[PDB]
Amino acid sequence: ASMFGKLREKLKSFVKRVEEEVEKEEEEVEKKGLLDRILTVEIKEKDVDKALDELEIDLLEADVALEVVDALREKIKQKLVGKKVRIGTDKGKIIEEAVKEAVSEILETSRRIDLIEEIRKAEKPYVIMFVGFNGSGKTTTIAKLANWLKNHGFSVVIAASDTFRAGAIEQLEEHAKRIGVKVIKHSYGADPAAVAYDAIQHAKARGIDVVLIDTAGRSETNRNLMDEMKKIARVTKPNLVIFVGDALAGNAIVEQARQFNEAVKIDGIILTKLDADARGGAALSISYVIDAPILFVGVGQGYDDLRPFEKEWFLERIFG
Amino acid sequence: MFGKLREKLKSFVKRVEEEVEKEEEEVEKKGLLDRILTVEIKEKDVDKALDELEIDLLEADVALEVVDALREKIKQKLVGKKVRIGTDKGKIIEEAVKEAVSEILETSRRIDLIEEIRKAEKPYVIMFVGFNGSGKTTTIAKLANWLKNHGFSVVIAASDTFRAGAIEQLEEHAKRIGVKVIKHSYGADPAAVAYDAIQHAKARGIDVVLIDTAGRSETNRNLMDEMKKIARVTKPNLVIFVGDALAGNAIVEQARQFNEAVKIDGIILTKLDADARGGAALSISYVIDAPILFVGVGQGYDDLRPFEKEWFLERIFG
Amino acid sequence: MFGKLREKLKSFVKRVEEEVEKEEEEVELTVEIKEKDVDKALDELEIDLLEADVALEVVDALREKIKQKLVGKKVRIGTDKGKIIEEAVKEAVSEILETSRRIDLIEEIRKAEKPYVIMFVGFNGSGKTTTIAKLANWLKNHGFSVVIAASDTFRAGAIEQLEEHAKRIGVKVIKHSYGADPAAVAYDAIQHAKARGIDVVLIDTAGRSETNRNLMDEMKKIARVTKPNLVIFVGDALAGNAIVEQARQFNEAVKIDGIILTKLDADARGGAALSISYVIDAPILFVGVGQGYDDLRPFEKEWFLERIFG
Amino acid sequence: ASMFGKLREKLKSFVKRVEEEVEKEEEEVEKKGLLDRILTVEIKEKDVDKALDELEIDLLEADVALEVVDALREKIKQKLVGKKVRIGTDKGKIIEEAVKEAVSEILETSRRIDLIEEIRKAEKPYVIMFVGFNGSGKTTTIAKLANWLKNHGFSVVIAASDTFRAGAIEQLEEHAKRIGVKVIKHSYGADPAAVAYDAIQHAKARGIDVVLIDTAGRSETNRNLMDEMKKIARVTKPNLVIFVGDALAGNAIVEQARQFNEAVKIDGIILTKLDADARGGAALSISYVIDAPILFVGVGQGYDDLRPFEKEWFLERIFG
Amino acid sequence: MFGKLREKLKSFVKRVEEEVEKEEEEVELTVEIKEKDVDKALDELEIDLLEADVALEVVDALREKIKQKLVGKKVRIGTDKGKIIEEAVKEAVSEILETSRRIDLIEEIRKAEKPYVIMFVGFNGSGKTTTIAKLANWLKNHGFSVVIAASDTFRAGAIEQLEEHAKRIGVKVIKHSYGADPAAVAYDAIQHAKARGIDVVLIDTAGRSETNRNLMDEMKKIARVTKPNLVIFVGDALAGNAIVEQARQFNEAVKIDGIILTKLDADARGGAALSISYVIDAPILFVGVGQGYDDLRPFEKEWFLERIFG
Amino acid sequence: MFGKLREKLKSFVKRVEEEVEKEEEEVEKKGLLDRILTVEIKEKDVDKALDELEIDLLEADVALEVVDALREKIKQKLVGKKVRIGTDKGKIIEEAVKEAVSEILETSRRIDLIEEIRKAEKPYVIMFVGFNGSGKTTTIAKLANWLKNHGFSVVIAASDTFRAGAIEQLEEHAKRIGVKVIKHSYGADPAAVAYDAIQHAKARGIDVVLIDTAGRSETNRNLMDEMKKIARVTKPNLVIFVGDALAGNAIVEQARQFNEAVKIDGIILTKLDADARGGAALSISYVIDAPILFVGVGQGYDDLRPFEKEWFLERIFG
């Protein structure tokens, strides 16, 4: 549980800095003998500004996207400046509350997504396309989501559209064998869209609820991964596009999502290896940047270690 | 040769046949054979088969754009069509497919090379684009020969300036057929060399200028930007994309890339005689909306042959 | 130096001179230069210029100017045609070097609310790191306080070199740990300058992409964070087959305000140096003509023209 | 503790196969009515040979070096063939005992090394050179060994001869700061041997017991990592050369050690991330191939998670 | 086909013929070829052969043989010099193709305790995978049972292709999971062949290093595990600037017993094909002269010589 | 220029001085100044300083072999040496260092180029080895000029067959000084071209053949094997390694690699005038046991200058 340790440390450091400025403000009032007229201080811009400048530095070093750093700064500044604190109250809690609110607001996307609700109301099959670079944990995630879907009453078939990774496909089939879901695949190096469109036809004929599409995570010979993704999305017309990312790649995940998003619009996000994320700045940033909710998080190597995302659990982890 | 594509078009016909058969058996059931002599193909008859054809065609390297256009050209040529109960549906259905494929090979311009040249103010400038290993260099030698045998004078610009090997090869074949090669020093500016060739052609009253271009980015780097610069400077009458037909997994995407930089007027496919798949070759004209002008069906100078849509269709449908 | 450029401009002038003489000797009070006198020479000039790394855009603008100055120009018989033609050409070249805004660095710093923030862009090997040290020295010698941000965070070597030079000339370098966020370091440096009333902050930036993401995006991020007063492209004049394309690329991401060309003194072709300002629409501010600190010289259009013609 | 799971599974499978052949042999005796004359069976070659052929296949797939596969086969064959088993005894235990012995014999190197004993008897400083490719965990290991050495009464200095990795050096110094040991370093890209020779001079003058040399784990521009290692070894004349390897790189660790060994002779081995090794074939093979004992193993991310190697703990892990 | 080789051998013959005629016409019962008659032509032959991909070792051996056959040779006046010289040259070339042991494959299989194990070595693109299928077909057509080990474990594509061809010709392929240990697969295949009384096991191997370790080491490991009856190098005849070096490399790790050259029919230079057997000291066993199964032909020295001379 | 090396040799002298001073102060203590006029340098006086010099020299790019040889040549030139109490030790100590450095520059053969050529049976064949960017090509042009100005006829073989750029450059400079360049087509066999050059020289009675060689592996590939093949075929009288002196982190290791393939007889260092470090330049002759023959101290033809050990020592010790 050194989880989000670096983010937590920088937010903690900000709170302390401001707290100490507020404390000087109180002592000034006490010293000047103003206690016969005033028992509160009003947080001023000079109490926060340097602390805000250093938070910008610290958060950028902690992998927080610039956009999110700016949104956080202004929310906090707006919540604090002019805020009245009575001498002898816990100023730390008042300051931390503003930060916590700002962070919580950062986690809001213009759409929450109830996966089960979305599938139930939809004309079957409900088609989910996965995007992401190799190493993100896409393949395992798809098996785990299949398991979760099945455990919730839905039938599922998987399209192996990662056609050039015979290893990944073999893995995919072993897991799918173990959970009783079918994998549709063609020959090595097959056309990814044909494979997926095939899995869709299979789903229609056998009345399967959900089609999950495993995709490639690198470009093969002359044609962009992004182009291939657009072609799969044109052919399969997904109900939902999920971006998969490795929480440990703090230096790349937001940018990876940005690249995919420009090609095929992301509806939802899944973060793997989150339990091992000792930093947290990227994970905190991604929903905001892509304006898409995090649907699931990987917190272990077991099938039940793919958990639906809960905002409050995430905040608990950041703040303690 | 095109066997794969032909295998797939063949099985689609078979599947539609089986559905039409059930349509007839259905008429049989209601004991209406005594008064109804025809059934009309319904969408329910072609639908699953069309989905299967989409799969099959994508796996055979047919571009998405073309697969979608084919589905609709066919789906609409069959649905509502009346067929005679008891006859062989095979001819009829295959006919519609054959038509759809034929329309797919229609581009918005046809190009009569000799006619375009004669009417044009000399020199007529032709720019070739394409990646290396598609036989661009040899193609340019062959096309030069062809133009001469039709009475045009020709000069070639060696604007593939970083490939000394290719340039040597080019001068050989050019000396062999009595055509001049204009070249500068190693690593010269491609546009400068081609512009130079053009001034020479004006001065000496040459009919045709062929610009041999690079087929890879140099260190500087970008191939597409280099092609843009050459087109800007030389203002080509005609831009021809050269591609190796055996590269079914690439050739269409190659053309798309060049097309975005400099608009392609015509296509030449090499090694087409050896193409036993044909999805890409079938796709390229539609995707780029440019006619295939010649095809390479051998290693002889006279194996670069004017493209005929009809020969192409025959090869497909056997 | 600019030898190749000079040789081809000279042949063009002599080529037209012949046609003009050959028209003075067609009369026999004035002779008029005609289109037929400049065309073939212009076309050959185009070939020659392209071979000397002159950007096409610049080649075309030169054609246009030379043509509008010469065609229809009437000159007295007996006069020196070669010199009149060359003067036209020289005017054309001089206009090519004229940018939509000359820039007085010192004036811009003084009239600006401190700190004046300069962001450098360019690829590695362009002399960026050394150039920043020299510019810092120059700025100090005109009585400005200076601080340098080591935002080239993945090159421990270049940062040591920077710190050594800076120490010599009494300039502080701000740096974080290895591979730090470049925008964070620059922002930090700016907060310091504010706190210390420093006049100038120089931002040293990466010159390659990391196992990470586009150099171009990184530059945009830095620019957003620091809101530079001035953005300066650094380029190596010997890279005639590259620098103009380099600057186009950068200019696309973050608008360039001025150019510094290094190793200019060794440039014996010059087409690229002649082109770069016109193409990016930014003045050349300093040129590097040696390895000494005083070898980063403020740029003079005149000096450049003299090197080109004679 | 899916630790060494794949190796364990293949050895288990071998035991079962032979056990079933022995069981048929017993039933044959019982069936033929020979119980009035014989109450034991003698394991024959035909009882083991196919099982031995499949063990060779299985062990090669489990990353066991060929050399070790051959040694294991012959030891087992020799222990089993002609072995007398009384009907009604536990044949499984008898067969497993032979396998366990063979495996244990495989772990014997012509030298065990008592590190503390070696340092105490030596003219100070005792110089240890580390070799290994990047990603092996060399740098962290050196800090941890420094800690262990210090906790055992020895003073320690570290040479930063990994001169081109400013990141790794910074890490190295943070850890060394935390445990109170000095790091000697020069400028970026400095000569690795000069740095190490410098740390040795420092050690002589201040009477430090141990010098640890952090080395590069990749070739820089034109000159082989192996050449650089030979040059460091010529200059520093180490008392001990330790090869560091990432237990998770089952496909490479034995070969990595082989390459280094040919250049500078390895005295001892350290395996990191062993606790996470779900295979075990390489770890089992390395001592034998290089004829060098494993001195320490990494079983966690804490400083006390670098543990002295014990053969019996290793066998316990393999067999259960 | 072998055109380049033919052209240069022919010019050498004609060059010496002149010197010999020019010596018949110096007498006037016999004329003796002298060193001064062959030297300059030999030196020019050396240049020409090196340019046609003939290995230096082979060029030198040819010099030696041609020289020992011609110098001091006395020929009757009136005789055809060109033909006598050419016969010498032809003998030299023929000896170059003679290896320290011709090999009768069928005989070796029959007289050997089954299974006879063949291990193939070579780099990707040499036609190894296709060649193994064709060799399997050939072996079956002579009444041997065959099984193939898919030890090229990191190429899912090539293994599918293999399995397709093999299925056509009634041959089983043994394979494990993706990226399996190559030696393990081959050993497995051998245990099967034993169990099933199969005559021949063909081992298909990798033709590049993985994110792993040297192809050459992998080949040694496989050879140790399988103790091949025969090791066969496969090479693409069109790779004249590579194949001999390829075989040297392999031969160094695992001794090669024989060679198969593919695409031989398209080879219009031939220097490498002429060289490979002499250099590695192994016979060429089969040549690929087309895409049909019957286009893997047993190799005939005579056939090769006829293609070279006429 | 060589400032780094000079900085380090300078500080070693200073450290030995300080120790010798303590030796004298020690004599002072025992009140023996009245009868003893000299002290002899002991190993305890040079030891720590020699360890420091090892560090300093390694960091300055001095090869290990040379650092070790220097330590011993010095340690043995100083230990046991008597110095005069009260004088300046600086001259004395520096003298020993200067000597050690001088011996380090001694190779087992000296090479008089003109003399070796005159006595040899023509053509005298010289093979150049080295990696690209070390100025091999230009060096060969300059050396050609020099040979001519000393009355030798020269032909050059263009065996750098895959670099059309370099070959053009070479022909220019060669035409400029009236020397012939023998070349074949692009990508020709280097040994064939050089052998060809040699036959030409015999035929036309040329004194000297200079073989321009490749400086990188081609796709085939190996550079060293290619050099072996060329030496085997051409049987060089002399093999010269060319290296850029500014590459202090590489040049010695480059020479080692070539030396292992084909034994180097002499060395030419380019851009030496710009070398402000000098550890590598100081090291190379010893490591390879081959004399530096010429040095490049400028861009002029006459800036390729015969090497003089004495000039070199002066440059170091100022």
Numbering used by the authors:
A (entry chain B), D (entry chain B): -1 to 318
B (entry chain C), F (entry chain C): 1 to 318
C (entry chain A), E (entry chain A): 1 to 28, 37 to 318
Q: What is written in the article reporting this PDB entry?
A:
The apo receptor was crystallized in two different crystallization conditions in absence of guanine nucleotide and its structure solved de novo using single wavelength anomalous dispersion of selenium; the structure is therefore not biased towards any of the previously solved homologues. Our Pfu-FtsY structure is the first representative from the Archaea kingdom. The αN1 helix of Pfu-FtsY is not bent and its axis is shifted towards the core of the four α-helix bundle resulting in an overall more compact, albeit extended, N domain. In Pfu-FtsY, the N-terminus of helix αN1 is positively charged and could constitute the primary membrane interaction site supporting initial attachment of the targeting complex to the membrane and/or interaction with the membrane-embedded translocon.
The process is mediated by evolutionarily related signal recognition particles (SRPs) and their cognate membrane-associated receptors (SRs also called FtsYs in Bacteria and Archaea). The core proteins of SRPs and SRs are GTPases that each contain a structurally and functionally conserved NG domain where the G domain adopts a ras-like fold responsible for GTP binding and the N-domain adopts a four α-helix bundle fold. Here we describe the X-ray structures and solution conformations of FtsY, the SR from the hyper-thermophilic archaeon Pyrococcus furiosus (Pfu), in its free and GDP•magnesium-bound forms. While the overall architecture of the archeal receptor resembles its previously described bacterial homologues from the SRP/SR GTPases family, the structure of Pfu-FtsY reveals novel features: The elongated N domain lacks the N-terminal extension observed in all other bacterial FtsYs and is instead characterized by a long N-terminal helix αN1 that packs against the NG core in a different way; sequence analysis suggests that archeal receptors may cluster apart from their bacterial homologues.
